[PDB]
Design a protein around this ligand. Sequence first.
Ligand SMILES: CCCCCCCC/C=C/CCCCCCCC(=O)O[C@@H](COC(=O)CCCCCCCCCCCCCCC)COP(=O)([O-])OCC[N+](C)(C)C
Ligand SMILES: CCCCCCCC/C=C/CCCCCCCC(=O)O[C@@H](COC(=O)CCCCCCCCCCCCCCC)COP(=O)([O-])OCC[N+](C)(C)C
Ligand SMILES: CCCCCCCCCCCC(=O)OC[C@H](COP(=O)(O)OCC[N+](C)(C)C)OC(=O)CCCCCCCCCCC
Ligand SMILES: CCCCCCCCCCCC(=O)OC[C@H](COP(=O)(O)OCC[N+](C)(C)C)OC(=O)CCCCCCCCCCC
Lengths: 80, 80
Amino acid sequence: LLGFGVALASLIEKCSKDKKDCSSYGSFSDAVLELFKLTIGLGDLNIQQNSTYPILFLFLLITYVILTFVLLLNMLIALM
Amino acid sequence: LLGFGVALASLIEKCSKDKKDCSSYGSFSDAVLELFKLTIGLGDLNIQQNSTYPILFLFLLITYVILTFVLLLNMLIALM
Ligand SMILES: CCCCCCCC/C=C/CCCCCCCC(=O)O[C@@H](COC(=O)CCCCCCCCCCCCCCC)COP(=O)([O-])OCC[N+](C)(C)C
Ligand SMILES: CCCCCCCC/C=C/CCCCCCCC(=O)O[C@@H](COC(=O)CCCCCCCCCCCCCCC)COP(=O)([O-])OCC[N+](C)(C)C
Ligand SMILES: CCCCCCCCCCCC(=O)OC[C@H](COP(=O)(O)OCC[N+](C)(C)C)OC(=O)CCCCCCCCCCC
Ligand SMILES: CCCCCCCCCCCC(=O)OC[C@H](COP(=O)(O)OCC[N+](C)(C)C)OC(=O)CCCCCCCCCCC
């Protein structure tokens, strides 16, 4: 959560032309909150960020989904 | 559900300056409904409440998520 939170957050450029737009993954704690809400399954996944690399953003975000929604949570049920 | 419902609800101060704003966790039954919808996975988690302690609010809300979304539901699948 914290590794991909800081990576995704540091990938986003300046806030906006008006300081508040599509800055979901703006800072660290805001990106950590967005990833937490993808694990719970709440909200709406929005990839149209003010990002310099949309492909690298999708790669890190989909890797996070594969590592937690698929591997870690189902492996928790199996070990339990 | 009811323990954290009444705790989170009693943490929120007066309704608003207009009696209706960001009062998701306003009263008891409204906070119980919001927690129920986090368990089902519906809605959108909004922590920007008219709260006096945003940190204590996150602590109680994340503890609820750890106790039900992680422990209790997966342990239900294991015992079943
Ligand atoms: C499958 C999942 C399982 C669960 C996984 C959970 C993983 C964790 C997920 C956590 C991510 C949640 C979001 C964090 C960031 C939100 C923003 C925020 O509030 O920032 C603040 C910090 O806020 C905190 O420090 C959050 C509260 C404490 C940490 C969380 C609980 C710790 C775990 C408890 C466990 C208890 C266990 C039981 C114990 C008996 C900082 O804000 P600021 O920079 O000061 O703002 C300045 C500007 N402003 C003042 C105008 C605003
Ligand atoms: C993983 C999860 C699993 C499920 C967990 C579920 C846990 C439970 C979750 C419950 C939380 C749901 C929300 C409750 C509060 C909503 C608000 C509300 O209506 O308030 C009202 C009460 O409302 C009730 O009393 C709700 C209905 C009855 C209880 C729920 C069903 C009982 C379980 C059945 C089981 C059957 C089993 C099978 C039997 C064969 C009160 O409103 P008011 O104060 O009078 O309003 C005044 C102002 N106004 C009139 C203008 C409005
Ligand atoms: C054990 C606890 C588990 C639960 C999670 C608790 C922490 C949640 C996030 C809190 C953030 C906060 O509040 O501060 C985080 C602070 C400052 O944040 P900021 O950049 O000013 O953004 C604030 C944005 N606002 C104003 C909108 C709120 O440091 C940082 O940004 C540094 C980030 C890089 C260092 C950390 C990397 C960690 C890697 C993994 C190590 C294991
Ligand atoms: C066994 C049944 C399971 C399913 C759940 C059923 C109940 C759901 C909620 C109904 C609420 C309601 O309707 O009344 C709850 C009432 C009055 O509510 P109010 O504060 O006026 O808010 C009404 C808000 N409105 C107007 C928007 C609807 O008491 C209370 O607030 C007292 C709360 C503290 C005492 C109870 C604590 C319980 C702790 C756990 C014990 C095991």
